[PDB]
Symmetry: D2
Subunit: 221 residues, 4 copies
């Protein structure tokens, strides 16, 4: 198998894109560490991966708590000694209305998960990737830094912010042979498996190859 002997951490793995990425990496032989808030929705996906012949485990982790993320990483690295693929996929939305109508607590909840947690996760897993001189950090971004979403202002800030965050970290980590990439829409409707296929393509590149960004347009009809 392409990813046999590897460990893959997928956030927001309970449904949709996250679930599909989990199954895909599991089918290639990676041991998939699934995380989300709801353990029960995770277990369905854990069972499917195992049923089809792969390895998977489930961990509740509240991504808005820094200590919780450090506890989660410490457990994963203590149990398996490595993380080959970190997929930043967990995301929240807020589309209630204009930015002045957004409460600070709603701002905090959205930025904590969409922007701060991918930084915390990279901070928790990158030092191990550096020491091993290998690994992928792959970020699912639902906006390409181009068009604002009226009534989704904080949301937009978090995605363009993620893009700038991870584009910068890519220049920092490449000297240690660690690869940070971005997956984003190339239009403006995408089947989860297509994004899963892109992540699989990223995680199985030749050693020297460094694809930094893939833009995907809606599945054909």
């Amino acid at each position: 198998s392409s990813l046999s002997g590897q460990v893959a951490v997928v956030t927001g793995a309970s449904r949709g894109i996250g679930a599909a990425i989990a199954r895909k990496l599991g089918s290639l032989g990676a041991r998939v560490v699934l995380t989300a808030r709801d353990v029960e929705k995770l277990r369905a996906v854990e069972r499917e991966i195992v049923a089809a012949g792969g390895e998977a485990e489930s961990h509740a982790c509240d991504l808005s708590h820094s200590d919780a993320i450090a506890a989660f990483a410490t457990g994963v690295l203590a149990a398996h000694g490595r993380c080959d693929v970190l997929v930043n996929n967990a995301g929240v939305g807020w589309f209630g209305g204009p930015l002045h109508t957004m409460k600070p607590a709603e701002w905090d909840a959205l930025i904590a998960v969409n922007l701060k947690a991918p930084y915390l996760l990279l901070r928790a897993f990158a030092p191990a990737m550096i020491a091993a001189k290998r690994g992928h950090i792959i970020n699912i971004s639902s906006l390409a830094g181009k068009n604002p979403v009226a009534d989704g202002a904080a949301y937009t800030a978090s995605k363009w912010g993620l893009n700038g965050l991870m584009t910068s970290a890519a220049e920092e980590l490449r000297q240690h042979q660690v690869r940070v990439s971005l997956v984003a829409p190339g239009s403006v409707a995408i089947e989860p498996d297509d994004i899963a296929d892109v992540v699989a393509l990223l995680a199985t590149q030749a050693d020297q190859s460094f694809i930094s960004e893939v833009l995907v347009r809606p599945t054909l009809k």
Copy 2:
């Protein structure tokens, strides 16, 4: 005078771009409400504005505290009944090293000022601008959403995030005749007065005119 009878709030007004924007708007007749952390550096600038014949006042405000920002806005609107120009200029930097080396508390301090405070300020002053169907919110962004800064990853995230935030809020507010604009570098070295001149140009547009973004390249030699 072009801005006579108007109130202009300028954040980070104690030195450089902020100071220069303060003096410029003061010279056009605006009453300038200066804010920063250090009251003493503010007073020098307050004295210059008054010395040259304008009106100005100084207020310490810690932009990383939401309540402090609401207290500050409440005072300004209670004292003058209006805010015609809000300039988001206060900014912090962090260029210590790669993103995994950045401490969460340093992340928090940078994002609180560069990204959350401009949202809090818009939230505190926009409702008054909406009710009056007029006003400018002008954001000084030191990056145009284009090039990452290695070793300034959080910093980059905060500027691209600001851009997406304010581009979205511009679509929301325009229906109430309130105008959100962005000033940013167009290259890659800029004299503070040139940025001050751009802000003055934004604050004095024809009613109907909506310049949303100005890119500025280094002062000529």
Copy 3:
């Protein structure tokens, strides 16, 4: 006023944005050299400039030919010896269908005007601006380089192309005190000709030290 004794070239100056930019520049005291395919469409705008007490001449310039652009600039320089303000405003459209149905002759007509003419104009006037150590070249772009127009593929290319062409020339000419700028829309989704004319006014009359390189404009407030 501000631009007294300057000459401003303005292409596609017979209506809309070009017309307004013409009127706005003349009203600030610049002599407005106007351009269009046909000299008769220009008379109306030339009249409004004079009537308000500014100077204005009219030339037929076919922007699809180099020779034509060369002869046109030669004349302007022989007559006045300077060009202070070159406004690349003329453009064509093509939205007939998908790219593969577009014929080479249509491609050529669109690219010649939208992408090649602004270069030729810059080439013909930049020497005088460089020698004089001052000048503005201002470009009106209907696309900001972000979103594609389906069934306007060549049109899209010509605009993103223009943005790249003039962003680069701007770096080349800074050293000579010549300022190249762009004006483009600020949203994907409606803009009053005067809003643009005002922005152009603003660029044409900046402080010498300052260099505004791009201005994005959103639809006029209603």
Copy 4:
């Protein structure tokens, strides 16, 4: 392997990226139609493809002429009846000086190859792809649309132009199951030809449902 019984056109296929893309596509079982100004520079690459047991033909195509591109595509279609993979890879450079010193003939040579040829090629092969309800058009772009090259102004225009041209054509052709894509650099600041060839391989062999529209590549890990 993956591409058995397909035909892949590859322009500028005599060395570097084009050479590698050629080898990589042949090794997956596609018949590789190679292009260059001169048919002799192609023999080496054609030999490597056959030697490894793939098929490959060589044509001299002068991309600066429409007729030439038309005659070239006509031949390929008469000979095989399909083009599965069109790789727009050939390009020229010009970095002689600032835009105003660039002569119209040099402008024309650069634009004809960099911007007009990819359109002409797409126009000549898209009809067959549309009829067949499958096909890839893959474009190699050396600029991502963000940063200007001072003293490479026309070059810059041709690349940002290409990005806009092909982003638009991609929207036009989705409905017919034809997939247009871009490959470009991921940093302002050095990339192994095989990295590109691999990405092209990846695009050429996607699932039918999927549509990757752009791939950015950073310099090869050292």
